[PDB]
Design a protein around this ligand. Structure first.
Ligand code: SF4
Lengths: 92, 270, 588, 159
C-alpha cells in the first residue's frame, strides 16, 4: 500500500544518511522586489477555485462558463493593470 | 568501454558516496541537513502516483494530482533553506533569484493540468488511463501540452540555467557551499524529477496501457524512453536564457494562454 | 640606406626648438631609432613638454615613458654624465613624427617632477618606474608598487639585483604563512588610491575579481560601490609579471627570439617582427624581398587568427554563440598552415635575425590557395551575421563612448583610435617590412567610437588582410630566405655543413652570440592589439643592454577607470570583454 | 570487492585552473571531451600556466578547499617547473608547495596530451598518491623499445 512505500522511502533516507555518517546586515538596494512571489501567493489562491472547478463542469453548463469567463476576465484586468502601472516588469 | 548511457549516472552516484564531510562554520545545521531531502523526497514520492500496472499499482488512492501540486509547491523550500543555510549573501541572493524564477514558473502547471482533468472529469488515475482508449487528450490541447512542458522543465530542471551561475554580479550560484553527498542528492533529485515528469506526461496526456500488438507495460516504457530522448534533445538544444527574457515570457504569455484554454475546453465539452 | 646612423638635426622640430630656446642644454644624439633623441636637464622638462604640447602641430600622444640604468655603458661618447636616465617617447600624429626626450639623474637625487598632469596615461608608467627602478617621482598621487607585492624589497631592474630565482631562497613557505595571515585579514585601509569615500554603509568595497570565462586571465579590480554605481575602480595588476625586460639582459640576440613569442599568445610572428627588425637595424642588414613577403604572410595569418578570436568572443559574450563556434573549426585550419610553415601551432619562434628558419615547403601554394578560395563565403556569412544583427547592435550603441581627445590622452591605439576620425595606421604612415609595395585601405569609424564600430572595423581589417594574403600568394618572388651578411644569424645550414668559414661563423654566433656594435634601435608595428614597439640598446656586447617592450594593453587596461565612472557592473563586464586587453601583454 | 575503485576510475570531476596563456589548447580539448565543473565540488585540479609568486596563496586555498581525495595534474613546462622563466617573480614549479601526481611536459601541451593525462590518471587511480608497487614503471621505460625501434622519418621539405 501507500504506507509501506512511505516506510520504504524513509528507511532508504535513514539508510543513506546513517551510512554516510559511518563511512566518514544592511542590504541597501540588494534583493527586495519579491512582489512577483506575492503575486504568486495571491494567484495560487485565485487558481485554487479553478482547481475545485475542474472536477465538475459538465453539470455546470452555460452559466458556469459565463461566470468563469467573468472570473478570468477580472483576473486578466488585474494582470494588465499590474503591467501598465509598472509592477510586473523587469525585476532584480 | 562502458556501453550504457545510464552507467555514467551509476558511477556518479557511487563517486558521491564515501566523501569526507566538513562542518561549515558560522552556519545553521538543521537546515543545512534538511534542504537536500526537501528536493529529493518530494519528487521521490511524486513517483507514488504512476499507474505502472492495475495489479501492481503502488498506491490506489482516489487523488494523485493534488499530491503532485503539493510536491510542486513544496519544492521551493529546498532552494530557500539552501539559500539561508549558505550563510553567504552571494549564495543567498543566488538562491533567492533561483527561487524567484521558480515560484514564477511553477504557476502554470496546475492551470495547464486543469484542461486534461476537466475533459477527464475525475482525479482517480485509473479513469484517466482508461479515458485514453481510442482518442488521446493531446489533439485539442496543444497549448496546454506545451505549457505543461515548459512548467515541468522550469522547476529547477536546469532549463532556466541560473542554478549554478548568476547573470547578475554581486551574487553567486548556491551550489558552491554544498560539496558532500548533498550535491549528488541534488542530481539524483532532478533525475527522478525529469523521469517523473516524463512518466506523468505519457500517462496523463498520451495513452498509457494501450497494447496495440504488444504487451502494454513495455509500450508505456518505450514511449517514456522516446519522450526521455526528446526531452534530452530539446534540453540540450535549449540555450541558456538570461534572467530578463525569462521574466518577460513568464506571467505575461502563459496565464492568458491557459485561461483561454480553460474557456475553449469548457465551451466545447458541452 | 634606411639603417645608417643619422642625427636628424636638420629636422624642422630641431630648428624650431633651437629658435625657441636658442643654444645649449640640447645634445643631439646619433642613433638608428629613426627619431630625434634629445637630452634635456630635468629642470627644463616641463617647459619643453608644455611648448611641444601647444606647438602649431602638437605632439598629442605620449607613446612611452620608462627608465634606463646606464651605469655600465663603457661606450658613452657624446652623452651627458648620467647614473640613471628616464626617456619619454612622444608622437605628433599631424606630423607623423616622433621625439624622444632623455632626463639624466644622479644616484643620490633620483627625482623628477611628475608628467601625469599633461598626459594622464603616464601615471601608471611613473608608478612602474617607481616599482622596477628606484626613481621617486615627486607629485605622484598614489606612488605604490604596481608589479611586485607590497613587501618586496629591491628594484628588480637594477643591475646589482641578482636576476635569477636560484640566487634567492626557494619556496620554503616562510612567506606563505605571512601571506596567509594577510589574506585572512582582508581589510581596506583606504590607501588604494584616493579612496575619498569612507568605509561604512554608504560605500561598499568589492574585489570583483572575475574568475569566470572570457575574463582573459584572473585579476582583481577593487571597486567602491554606492547605489550599485562605480564610485571608483582601482585595478590590482602585476600578478602575471614574467620579468621579460630583465630576461632580455641575460640572453643573446639569437636566444631571446623565443621570449618574444610569449608577449602575446595570439601574436606569434607578429611579436617576432619588431624584435628582428630592431636587431637588423642594429646590424645594418637590408633583407631580400622574399624575406619581406614571407614575414607579411605570417603576420597577416596571425592577425587574421587574432581578429577571428576577437569577433567570436564578442558574439559569444553579448550574443548567440551557436553559429560562431564554427569559427573555432576555421581557426583549426589556420593552425594546420602555421605548423605546416613554422612547425608548431602557437609560439612559432620561426623568425631569425636576417631571415627565417627554413624555406617554405613545396606544397605551400596549393594550401594557401585552398584557404583563400574557401574563406570569402564564410567571411561574408559572418559579415551578414554581425552587421545586420539588431539585439546586440541596439544594446551596443553609445556604451561608454569616447572621442579623439579622450583616446589621445590615454595612449589608446589600434581599433580604439581608428574608431575615431583620425586616419593613423603605422603600416601606411611608417611603412615597414615591404608594406609600401602593396595596395590596401584603412577602414575608419567616422567620429563615434563604440563597440559596434570596433567590431565592424575588425571585420573590415580582416577583409583587407585577406586581400593582402592573396596579393602575397600571387606576387611571391624568388630567391633566398636569408640575407647575405656576416651578422645573419644563423647562416644557411647547407652552407654551414660544407664550408669552413660559414661553420666558424655559425659556431661563434650560436655559442658566444653575435657581436652587435654599440648603438640604439627602435621599431614599432601595428600588432593584433594596438601598437607594439621594441626599443633596444646595445653596449657592444653579445647581449642587450636594455630591452623595452611597449605594449598597448597596459594603456588599454589603464583607460577603463576614466570611462566607466558612472555605470553599472554589467556595463563594466561588457566593457572588459570589449576592450582588447590580455594579461600577458599588460604584465609582459 | 574493489567497487569503490571502479567508481573512482569511471568518473572524475575536473577543476580547470588554466591561466592567461596555454589555456587555448586546453579549451580545444574541453570543447571536444565535454558549465558542470564548479568550485568546492571537484576532486581533480589541472594546474596549468605559470605559477606566479604573487597568486600562489590562491592556489593553496583552492587546494585546501577540495575534498579528501585530491589529485593534481601539472601541465606545461611553466607549471611542472619554473620552465623557461627561471626568474625572481616565478616559483620554480607548483610541486614545491602542493603534492603533484601526474606531470605533462610541453609548452603548450596538446589536447591529445590532456587525453593521455586522463588515461594515466585513471590508470593510477585504478591501482589500490600510492605507488602500489606498480608506478616504478615509467613512460621513459615502458615505451623505450617502441621509441628506439624508430629509424626513418619524413623529410621536412614536404607537407
Ligand atoms: S607552458 Fe608555454 S604556453 Fe603554457 S604558460 Fe608556460 S610559456 Fe605559456
Amino acid at each position: 500500500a501507500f504506507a509501506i512505500f512511505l516506510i520504504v522511502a524513509i528507511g532508504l533516507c535513514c539508510l543513506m544518511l546513517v551510512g554516510g555518517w559511518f563511512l566518514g546586515a544592511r542590504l541597501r538596494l540588494s534583493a527586495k522586489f519579491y512582489l512577483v512571489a506575492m503575486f504568486f501567493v495571491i494567484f495560487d489562491v485565485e487558481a485554487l477555485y479553478l482547481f475545485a472547478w475542474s472536477t465538475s463542469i459538465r453539470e455546470s453548463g452555460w452559466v458556469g462558463f459565463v461566470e468563469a469567463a467573468i472570473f478570468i476576465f477580472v483576473l486578466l484586468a488585474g494582470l494588465v493593470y499590474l503591467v501598465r502601472i509598472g509592477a510586473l516588469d523587469w525585476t532584480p | 568501454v562502458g556501453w550504457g548511457g545510464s552507467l555514467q549516472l551509476v558511477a556518479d552516484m557511487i563517486k558521491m558516496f564515501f566523501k569526507e564531510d566538513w562542518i561549515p562554520k558560522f552556519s545553521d545545521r538543521v537546515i543545512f541537513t534538511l534542504a537536500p531531502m526537501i528536493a529529493f523526497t518530494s519528487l521521490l514520492l511524486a513517483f507514488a502516483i504512476v499507474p505502472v500496472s492495475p495489479g501492481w499499482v503502488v498506491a490506489d488512492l482516489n487523488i494523485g494530482i493534488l499530491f503532485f501540486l503539493m510536491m510542486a509547491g513544496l519544492a521551493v523550500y529546498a532552494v530557500l533553506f539552501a539559500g539561508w543555510s549558505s550563510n553567504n549573501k552571494y549564495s543567498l541572493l543566488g538562491a533567492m533569484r533561483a527561487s524567484a524564477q521558480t515560484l514564477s514558473y511553477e504557476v502554470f502547471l496546475g492551470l495547464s493540468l486543469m484542461g486534461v482533468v476537466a475533459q477527464a472529469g475525475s482525479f482517480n488515475m485509473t479513469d484517466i488511463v482508461n479515458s485514453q482508449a481510442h482518442v488521446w487528450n493531446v489533439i485539442p490541447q496543444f497549448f496546454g501540452f506545451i505549457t505543461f512542458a515548459i512548467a515541468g522543465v522550469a522547476v529547477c530542471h536546469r532549463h532556466p540555467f541560473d542554478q549554478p551561475e548568476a547573470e547578475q554580479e554581486l551574487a553567486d550560484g548556491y551550489h558552491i557551499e554544498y560539496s558532500g553527498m548533498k550535491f549528488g542528492l541534488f542530481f539524483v533529485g532532478e533525475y527522478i524529477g525529469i523521469v517523473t515528469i516524463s512518466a506523468l506526461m505519457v500517462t496523463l496526456f498520451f495513452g498509457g496501457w494501450q497494447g496495440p500488438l504488444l504487451p502494454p507495460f513495455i509500450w508505456f516504457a518505450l514511449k517514456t524512453a522516446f519522450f526521455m530522448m526528446m526531452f534530452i534533445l530539446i534540453r540540450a538544444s535549449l540555450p541558456r536564457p538570461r534572467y530578463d527574457q525569462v521574466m518577460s515570457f513568464g506571467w505575461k504569455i502563459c496565464l492568458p494562454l491557459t485561461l483561454i484554454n480553460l474557456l475553449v475546453t469548457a465551451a466545447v465539452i458541452l | 640606406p634606411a639603417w645608417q646612423t643619422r642625427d636628424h638635426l636638420d629636422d624642422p622640430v630641431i630648428g624650431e626648438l633651437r629658435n625657441r630656446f636658442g643654444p645649449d642644454a640640447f645634445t643631439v644624439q646619433a642613433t638608428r631609432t629613426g627619431v630625434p633623441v634629445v637630452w634635456i636637464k630635468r629642470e627644463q622638462l616641463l617647459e619643453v613638454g608644455d611648448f611641444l604640447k601647444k606647438l602649431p602641430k602638437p605632439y598629442v600622444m605620449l607613446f612611452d615613458l620608462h627608465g634606463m640604468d646606464e651605469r655600465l655603458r663603457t661606450h658613452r661618447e657624446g652623452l651627458p654624465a648620467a647614473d640613471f636616465s628616464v626617456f619619454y617617447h612622444l608622437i605628433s600624429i599631424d606630423r607623423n613624427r616622433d621625439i624622444m626626450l632623455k632626463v639624466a639623474l644622479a644616484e643620490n637625487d633620483l627625482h623628477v617632477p611628475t608628467f601625469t598632469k599633461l598626459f594622464p596615461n603616464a601615471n601608471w608608467y611613473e608608478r612602474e618606474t617607481w616599482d622596477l627602478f628606484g626613481i621617486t617621482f615627486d607629485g605622484h598621487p598614489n606612488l605604490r608598487r604596481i608589479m611586485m607585492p607590497q613587501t618586496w624589497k629591491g628594484h628588480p631592474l637594477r643591475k646589482d639585483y641578482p636576476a635569477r630565482a636560484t640566487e634567492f631562497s626557494p619556496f620554503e613557505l616562510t612567506k606563505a604563512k605571512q601571506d596567509l595571515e594577510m589574506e585572512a585579514l582582508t581589510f581596506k585601509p583606504e590607501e588604494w588610491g584616493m579612496k575619498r569615500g569612507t568605509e561604512n554603509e554608504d560605500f561598499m568595497f568589492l574585489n570583483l575579481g572575475p574568475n569566470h570565462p572570457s575574463a582573459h586571465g584572473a585579476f582583481r579590480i577593487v571597486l567602491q560601490l554606492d547605489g550599485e554605481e562605480i564610485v571608483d575602480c582601482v585595478p590590482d595588476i602585476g600578478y602575471h609579471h614574467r620579468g621579460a625586460e630583465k630576461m632580455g639582459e641575460r640572453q643573446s640576440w639569437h636566444s631571446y627570439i623565443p621570449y618574444t613569442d610569449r608577449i602575446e599568445y595570439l601574436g606569434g610572428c607578429v611579436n617576432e617582427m619588431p624584435y628582428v627588425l630592431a636587431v637588423e637595424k642594429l646590424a645594418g642588414i637590408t633583407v631580400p624581398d622574399r624575406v619581406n613577403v614571407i614575414r607579411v604572410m605570417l603576420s597577416e595569418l596571425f592577425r587574421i587568427n587574432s581578429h577571428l578570436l576577437y569577433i567570436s568572443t564578442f558574439i559569444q559574450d553579448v550574443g548567440a554563440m551557436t553559429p560562431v563556434f564554427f569559427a573555432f573549426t576555421d581557426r583549426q585550419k589556420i593552425y594546420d598552415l602555421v605548423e605546416a610553415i613554422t612547425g608548431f601551432r602557437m609560439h612559432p619562434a620561426w623568425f631569425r635575425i636576417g631571415g627565417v628558419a627554413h624555406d617554405l615547403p613545396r606544397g605551400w601554394d596549393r594550401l594557401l590557395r585552398e584557404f583563400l578560395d574557401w574563406m570569402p563565403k564564410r567571411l561574408a556569412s559572418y559579415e551578414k551575421a554581425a552587421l545586420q544583427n539588431t539585439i546586440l547592435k541596439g544594446r551596443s550603441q553609445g556604451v561608454a563612448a569616447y572621442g579623439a581627445k579622450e583616446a589621445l590622452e590615454w595612449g589608446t591605439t589600434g581599433a580604439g583610435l581608428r574608431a575615431t576620425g583620425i586616419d593613423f595606421d603605422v603600416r601606411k604612415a611608417r611603412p615597414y617590412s615591404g608594406y609600401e609595395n602593396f595596395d590596401f585601405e584603412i577602414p575608419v569609424g567616422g567620429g563615434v567610437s563604440d563597440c559596434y564600430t570596433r567590431v565592424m572595423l575588425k571585420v573590415e581589417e580582416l577583409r583587407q588582410s585577406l586581400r593582402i594574403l592573396e596579393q602575397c600568394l600571387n606576387n611571391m618572388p624568388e630567391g633566398p630566405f636569408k640575407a647575405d651578411h656576416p651578422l645573419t644569424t644563423p647562416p644557411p645550414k647547407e652552407r654551414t655543413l660544407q664550408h669552413i668559414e660559414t661553420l666558424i661563423t655559425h659556431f661563434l654566433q650560436v655559442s658566444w652570440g653575435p657581436v652587435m656594435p654599440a648603438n640604439e634601435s627602435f621599431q614599432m608595428i601595428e600588432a593584433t592589439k594596438g601598437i607594439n614597439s621594441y626599443y633596444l640598446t646595445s653596449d657592444g656586447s653579445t647581449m642587450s643592454y636594455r630591452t623595452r617592450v611597449r605594449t598597448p594593453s597596459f594603456a588599454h587596461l589603464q583607460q577603463i577607470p576614466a570611462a566607466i565612472r558612472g555605470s553599472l557592473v554589467s556595463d563594466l563586464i561588457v566593457y572588459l570583454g570589449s576592450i582588447d586587453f590580455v594579461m600577458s601583454d599588460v604584465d609582459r | 570487492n574493489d567497487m569503490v575503485n571502479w567508481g573512482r576510475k569511471n568518473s572524475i570531476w575536473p577543476y580547470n585552473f588554466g591561466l592567461s596563456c596555454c589555456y587555448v589548447e586546453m579549451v580545444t580539448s574541453f570543447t571536444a571531451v565535454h558549465l558542470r565543473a564548479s568550485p568546492r565540488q571537484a576532486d581533480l585540479m589541472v594546474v596549468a600556466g605559470t605559477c606566479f609568486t604573487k597568486m600562489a596563496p590562491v592556489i593553496q586555498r583552492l587546494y585546501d578547499q577540495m575534498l579528501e581525495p585530491k589529485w593534481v595534474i601539472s601541465m606545461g613546462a611553466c607549471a611542472n617547473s619554473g620552465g623557461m622563466y627561471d626568474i625572481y617573480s616565478v616559483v620554480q614549479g607548483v610541486d614545491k608547495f602542493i603534492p603533484v601526481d601526474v606531470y605533462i611536459p610541453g609548452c603548450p601541451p596538446r589536447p591529445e596530451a590532456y587525453m593521455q593525462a586522463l588515461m594515466l590518471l585513471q590508470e593510477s587511480i585504478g591501482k589500490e598518491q600510492g605507488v602500489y608497487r606498480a608506478n616504478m614503471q615509467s613512460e621513459r621505460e615502458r615505451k623505450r623499445g617502441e621509441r628506439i625501434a624508430v629509424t626513418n622519418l619524413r623529410t621536412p621539405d614536404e607537407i
